[PDB]
Amino acid sequence: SGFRKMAFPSGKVEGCMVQVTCGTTTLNGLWLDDTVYCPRHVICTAEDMLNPNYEDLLIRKSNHSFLVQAGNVQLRVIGHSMQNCLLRLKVDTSNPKTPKYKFVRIQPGQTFSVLACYNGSPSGVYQCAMRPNHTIKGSFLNGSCGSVGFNIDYDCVSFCYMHHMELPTGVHAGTDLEGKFYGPFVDRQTAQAAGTDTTITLNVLAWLYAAVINGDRWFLNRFTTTLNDFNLVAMKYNYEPLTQDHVDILGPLSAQTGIAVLDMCAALKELLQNGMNGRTILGSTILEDEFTPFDVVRQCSG
Amino acid sequence: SGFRKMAFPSGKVEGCMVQVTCGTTTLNGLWLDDTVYCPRHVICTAEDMLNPNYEDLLIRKSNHSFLVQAGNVQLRVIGHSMQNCLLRLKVDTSNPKTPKYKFVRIQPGQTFSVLACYNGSPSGVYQCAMRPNHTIKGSFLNGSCGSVGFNIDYDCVSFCYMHHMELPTGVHAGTDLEGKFYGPFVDRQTAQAAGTDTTITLNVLAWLYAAVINGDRWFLNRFTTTLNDFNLVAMKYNYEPLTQDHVDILGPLSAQTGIAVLDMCAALKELLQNGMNGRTILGSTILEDEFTPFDVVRQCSG
């Protein structure tokens, strides 16, 4: 076998994408039941973007100012409201393709699939992790805004993200499906910045455990370490320091495999300090930090 | 600036996946019109897999030994035949979700999306390239044979691959949709080793061109090279030799950027010899070799 990073099948989400247009702006929307969710900035221009009063802009519009196209077929908007940074459009027809779904808020380090869209049309899917600074590095070839992140739990779709903008650093920021941003970011074209781009230490560890599980074990060692010393080294290399909850989360993977979390931490410490000297783990020539402890526990071994 | 390897949305291919079971073995099948395609070793006990007599296991099978399930529906098989390493099962129902499609044979270096399954159940999707040794680095679960590889050209699905085997090295081998293997492999348990892995120089060059298109071009050196000398450096670093055929394929990107193919070859040559030295390229600290010249063109005529 071996290891490949995978996104969840996008079919159930593809049937919920639509196009939303206001004036000259066209972007992607999420049609569930009789509602279409999209970033509220679709009602802006670029002039407005500089310091917008959304309550003011919103009231200047009717149901008719909104054009939502599900393919080459038009949907009629019969109402609207704003819920934090999303526009919540009521339409005259419930989406026959609505999957069983939930709205969940995720946290940094957690993973999900993203169906990148194109002014209403799905064109690609990828798997990513919300970075420690609450951003997403899915560097969209910068085409269409308002794409969606999700997970699939059995037959149920968990939507957790909706794309909103590009930060002046080239990385992305967005919202949960309640319209609340991830990160200390806002709905405006004021230059603001993401925190330090760091590596998700917890995911790299999960990944090293997966390497052990699939027989890769050359980086291991006889040393152990303390959480503090491990953390001191971690930070020097731009890795997130590991909190006590994070090591609990690795218990299950520690119990199976029989390698104690601090033992694995000692293995990582040595990789950081000595590089990999041209060498691979589960294939990559670099450490992977977009597979969670649960992802490894899913795919490899119940 | 940015990147993300994306796979095609998987919806049209999810609508064609079914589970095929023959005795103890269950594996995925591809349902187009009234035929279900699947690996022929589904008739083989885990026992015969050492060196199977396919013609005989087939003779000894009736339509009724075959259980084909599409969701909660059993499709009755009313005919069965073999075509190379694939089984072709005629079923009672023609697939209503059959997409416009074509069967094509791809060559080493080319990319495609993979819908990874487990008993007619699509569980993951990824983007990969056929490696120069005709293999694929797939992350595989168990029960995924009959996972299919494909490309989407407009509304047309081009099926190019179906999984069959796991090799020694842990890498994968499969066939085209007429059942002929990619590479010098067969559907039997034997030593059979693939050739040395190696990097796809053509895709790396195509990736450098896309880096340049998105404003990341610090790696360019105004100091040129001969094809001949570029290839000798490429072989030192385990990169495939660039043939005149490949130089031609880079033509459209060359014309679009104003960067002669040999100048891009000299930039690569310098990156192999000197390293990146901390710096980034499209956000990666490592060169990407699973993005083709065509994928650059399609993901820049967006």
Can you give a write-up of this model?
2 copies of one chain form a homodimer. Chain A has 8 helices and 13 strands. Chain A is α+β, with helices and mostly antiparallel strands and 302 residues long. Chain A has 3 domains: 3-14 and 100-197, Trypsin-like serine proteases (Thrombin, subunit H), CATH 2.40.10; 15-99, Thrombin, subunit H (Beta Barrel); 198-301, main proteinase (3clpro) structure, domain 3, CATH 1.10.1840.10. Chain A starts with 10 loop residues before the first helix and ends with a helix. The interface between A and B is large, with 36 and 37 residues. Chains A, B: Residues 1-302 form the Peptidase C30 domain. Chains A, B: Residues 1-302 are cytoplasmic. Chains A, B: Monomer. Homodimer. Only the homodimer shows catalytic activity. Chains A, B: It is found in: Host cytoplasm; Host Golgi apparatus.
